[PDB]
Design an enzyme around this catalytic site. Structure first.
Site, PDB file in Angstrom:
ATOM      1  N   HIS A   1       3.022  -2.379  -2.447  1.00 29.88           N
ATOM      2  CA  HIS A   1       4.523  -2.934  -2.138  1.00 29.88           C
ATOM      3  C   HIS A   1       4.806  -2.943  -0.691  1.00 29.88           C
ATOM      4  CE1 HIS A   1       5.223  -0.061  -5.673  1.00 29.88           C
ATOM      5  NE2 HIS A   1       5.130  -1.526  -6.207  1.00 29.88           N
TER       6      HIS A   1
ATOM      7  N   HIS B   1       7.952  -1.234   1.261  1.00 28.17           N
ATOM      8  CA  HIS B   1       9.164  -0.716   1.253  1.00 28.17           C
ATOM      9  C   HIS B   1       9.858  -0.760   2.322  1.00 28.17           C
ATOM     10  CE1 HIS B   1       7.986   2.446  -2.276  1.00 28.17           C
ATOM     11  NE2 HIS B   1       6.983   1.056  -2.566  1.00 28.17           N
TER      12      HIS B   1
ATOM     13  N   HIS C   1      11.892  -0.399  -2.499  1.00 32.70           N
ATOM     14  CA  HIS C   1      11.023  -1.505  -2.311  1.00 32.70           C
ATOM     15  C   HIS C   1      12.181  -2.451  -1.422  1.00 32.70           C
ATOM     16  CE1 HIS C   1       8.386  -0.954  -6.011  1.00 32.70           C
ATOM     17  NE2 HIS C   1       7.920  -0.132  -5.064  1.00 32.70           N
TER      18      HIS C   1
ATOM     19  N   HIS D   1      12.997  -5.436  -9.576  1.00 34.59           N
ATOM     20  CA  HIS D   1      11.631  -5.404  -9.626  1.00 34.59           C
ATOM     21  C   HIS D   1      11.174  -6.412 -10.464  1.00 34.59           C
ATOM     22  CE1 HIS D   1       7.791  -3.863  -8.461  1.00 34.59           C
ATOM     23  NE2 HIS D   1       7.481  -3.993  -9.869  1.00 34.59           N
TER      24      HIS D   1
ATOM     25  N   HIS E   1      11.800  -8.428  -5.861  1.00 30.87           N
ATOM     26  CA  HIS E   1      12.052  -8.049  -4.493  1.00 30.87           C
ATOM     27  C   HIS E   1      11.183  -8.542  -3.559  1.00 30.87           C
ATOM     28  CE1 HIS E   1      12.362  -3.761  -6.549  1.00 30.87           C
ATOM     29  NE2 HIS E   1      13.475  -4.399  -6.694  1.00 30.87           N
TER      30      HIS E   1
ATOM     31  N   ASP F   1       7.769  -6.879  -3.410  1.00 30.55           N
ATOM     32  CA  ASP F   1       7.022  -7.065  -4.582  1.00 30.55           C
ATOM     33  C   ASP F   1       5.682  -7.696  -4.584  1.00 30.55           C
ATOM     34  OD1 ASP F   1       8.341  -4.616  -5.958  1.00 30.55           O
ATOM     35  OD2 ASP F   1       9.628  -6.005  -7.209  1.00 30.55           O
TER      36      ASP F   1
ATOM     37  N   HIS G   1       0.113   2.592  -4.270  1.00 36.64           N
ATOM     38  CA  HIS G   1       0.420   3.264  -5.400  1.00 36.64           C
ATOM     39  C   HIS G   1      -0.886   3.975  -6.208  1.00 36.64           C
ATOM     40  CE1 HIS G   1       4.878   3.480  -5.004  1.00 36.64           C
ATOM     41  NE2 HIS G   1       4.531   2.130  -4.348  1.00 36.64           N
TER      42      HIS G   1
ATOM     43  N   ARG H   1       2.323   7.651  -4.388  1.00 34.34           N
ATOM     44  CA  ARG H   1       2.231   6.782  -3.185  1.00 34.34           C
ATOM     45  C   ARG H   1       1.255   7.347  -2.637  1.00 34.34           C
ATOM     46  NH1 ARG H   1       8.609   5.852  -0.827  1.00 34.34           N
ATOM     47  NH2 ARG H   1       9.436   5.237  -2.929  1.00 34.34           N
TER      48      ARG H   1
HETATM   49 CU   LIG Z   1       6.231   1.279  -4.479  1.00 34.66          CU
HETATM   50 ZN   LIG Z   2       9.963  -3.604  -6.345  1.00 33.37          ZN
END
Ligand SMILES: [Cu+2]
Ligand SMILES: [Zn+2]
Ligand SMILES: [Cu+2]
Ligand SMILES: [Cu+2]
Ligand SMILES: [Cu+2]
Ligand SMILES: [Zn+2]
Lengths: 157, 157
Positions: free
Chosen positions: A51, A53, A68, A76, A85, A88, A125, A148
Site C-alpha cells: 500500500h 501509507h 493508508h 479500505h 483508499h 489501496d 505487508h 509491515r
Molecule cells: Cu498497509
Molecule cells: Zn486501505
C-alpha cells in the site's frame, strides 16, 4: 531564472531490509493513470498487502508512515472498488523463486495533486490484504495485512 | 469527495547507515522560509557537506540521488550566496561527542513549487563543502565534499 511548477513524471520507492530487496517505479502514463512496475526478492511464495501509507516518515521505521493514504475519506477496498483508499494497491505475489513481479496500472494514485504520492511511503505487508471484505474489525480500515516488513519513501526519479 | 491541492507544511529525512543515525525535519515557516532542524550522531568531530540532491532515487544508494538540486541553473555556492543552488545548504558540524545539531533557516528550498524538495534526497558528505570557492575543478559544481556517507528521501511528515 525562476520557473513555474513541473509535475514529476516518474517516481521510485526502494525496499531494503536484511532479507528484502525491491525497486518500485511509478510512471505517469496517458489518461490520468499511473503505471506501477518493479520487482522485489526475499519473501517465500504467497500474497502480501502492498500500500501507499500517508507519511514519508521513517523516524519510527514503518510505523511512522502512519495509516493508508486516504484523501477522499473512503474505506479500505480492493483496487478495483470505488470505495477504496487512494493508497489501496491490493497484494503483491511472491513466486516459488521468492520474487515478486510488480506490474500494474492504477487510476487513483497520482504523481501530483491531492492524490500525489510523492513523499509518501510504500509499505510491504507480512501477510495478505483482505480487501475490507472480512469481519476482522481492522479489515475495513487496513485490510488485515499484518505487520509491515518493509517500506521506503516515494522519491522523484 | 475530491479536493484541491494542499501544500505539505512539514517534511523529514532519515539518515541510517551502520555507523549513522539522524532525523532532519523541514518545516514551512513565515515569509517563504524553511526551518531545518535535526540531529545526527555517528561522525567524528568536524565539518561535513550537507545538501539536497535532485532525485529521491536510492536504487543505486546515494549515487542515484544524482547531482545538487539546481532548478535556477546557478553554480555551487554558500547558502548565503545569491549564486548557489537551491540544494546548497553548506556544512553540518559534529561535536566532540560525535553529534550534529542542525538548526537553521533557509530562504531557497521550499516544500512546494519549483524549489519543492519533497521526494528529493538529503545527502550527508564524508568531508567538507568548500562553497565553490576553491580551485579544485569540482568546487564550482559540487563544492568538494567527497563521498556520500548517508542519504535519505525527503518525505511528508
Ligand atoms: Cu498497509
Ligand atoms: Zn486501505
Ligand atoms: Cu476532506
Ligand atoms: Cu552533495
Ligand atoms: Cu530553466
Ligand atoms: Zn551545489
Amino acid at each position: 531564472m525562476h520557473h513555474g511548477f513541473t509535475t514529476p513524471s516518474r517516481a521510485i520507492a526502494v525496499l531494503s531490509t536484511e532479507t528484502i530487496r525491491g525497486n518500485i517505479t511509478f510512471t505517469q502514463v496517458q489518461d490520468g493513470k499511473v503505471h506501477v512496475q518493479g520487482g522485489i526478492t526475499g519473501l517465500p511464495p504467497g500474497e502480501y498487502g502492498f500500500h501507499v501509507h500517508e507519511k514519508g516518515d521513517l523516524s519510527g521505521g514503518c510505523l511512522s508512515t502512519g495509516s493508508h493514504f486516504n484523501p477522499e475519506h473512503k474505506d479500505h477496498g480492493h483496487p478495483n472498488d470505488v470505495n477504496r483508499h487512494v493508497g489501496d494497491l491490493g497484494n503483491v505475489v511472491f513466486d516459488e523463486n521468492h520474487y515478486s513481479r510488480i506490474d500494474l496500472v492504477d487510476d487513483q494514485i497520482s504523481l501530483s495533486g491531492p492524490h500525489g504520492i510523492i513523499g509518501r511511503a510504500v509499505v510491504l505487508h507480512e501477510k495478505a490484504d483482505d480487501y475490507g471484505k472480512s469481519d476482522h474489525p481492522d479489515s475495513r480500515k487496513t485490510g488485515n495485512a499484518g505487520g509491515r516488513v518493509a517500506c521506503g519513501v516515494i522519491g522523484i526519479l
